[PDB]
Design a protein around this nucleic acid. Sequence first.
DNA 1: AGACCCGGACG
DNA 2: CGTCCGGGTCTA
Length: 273
Amino acid sequence: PQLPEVETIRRTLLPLIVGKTIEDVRIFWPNIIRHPRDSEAFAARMIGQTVRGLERRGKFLKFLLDRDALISHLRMEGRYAVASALEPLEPHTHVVFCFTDGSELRYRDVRKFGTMHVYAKEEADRRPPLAELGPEPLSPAFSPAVLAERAVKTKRSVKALLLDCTVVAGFGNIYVDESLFRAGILPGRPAASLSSKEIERLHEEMVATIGEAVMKGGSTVRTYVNTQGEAGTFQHHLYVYGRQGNPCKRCGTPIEKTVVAGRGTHYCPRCQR
DNA sequence: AGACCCGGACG
DNA sequence: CGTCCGGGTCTA
Ligand SMILES: [Zn+2]
């Protein structure tokens, strides 16, 4: 899940939990719990708190409780659902928050990569994992100037640059490849090689792509669904991601796939330079 | 780049 | 049944 997927989950999850009070927290894979590292303290502190809000920062969900914020990262496969305490759990359910009304917030994660950190609200933004995060791409804090400043300082690939959460928040493998295609820039280009015009174009396409994907409920390419289990539709608007061997939608040249920055990387060798 | 982790898709 | 694949990304 990237920004659009996490944002769609945020919007669809909030009404199902807002105003509910935690009665128990049950943990079946303690490694997911990162702070307090003692899962017993993590569970104990949340009991009796009420969910007041749910925000997103980058790819993180921020559950606003009473004293605390719970910072949750889904990583590759994490997901939330709300269901009755009376029903058996689904496979791969690793954390459950039980509410006083008999419903439960269930966290499922087949690969177990997800993380949870709880801090006092006023502390969460200055501690890991939120502390190092770059600007929200849909905010004024993300500008061509901000992008140029990081690009000029490094010979790392432009793909690696956009995947760096400290540069800009919320971009992952799908939206980096898509933004680079739309901007006409090869993903293996050294970041420092980008012209002023290319930086401007890249910023414009990054903002447009993310916004469009939010509007379309995210990209369901393998396993992502919203809180109601509904697939996104942005996958129908992809130019390159997962389209290797298929014709480019713009020029008909077969899309190629390589490895860049240790990641599967999709591009059109004609449209991108 | 490796680790954390698992199951699907493909030969 | 084995091999490679994956919307993330921390540390090594
Ligand atoms: Zn093309």
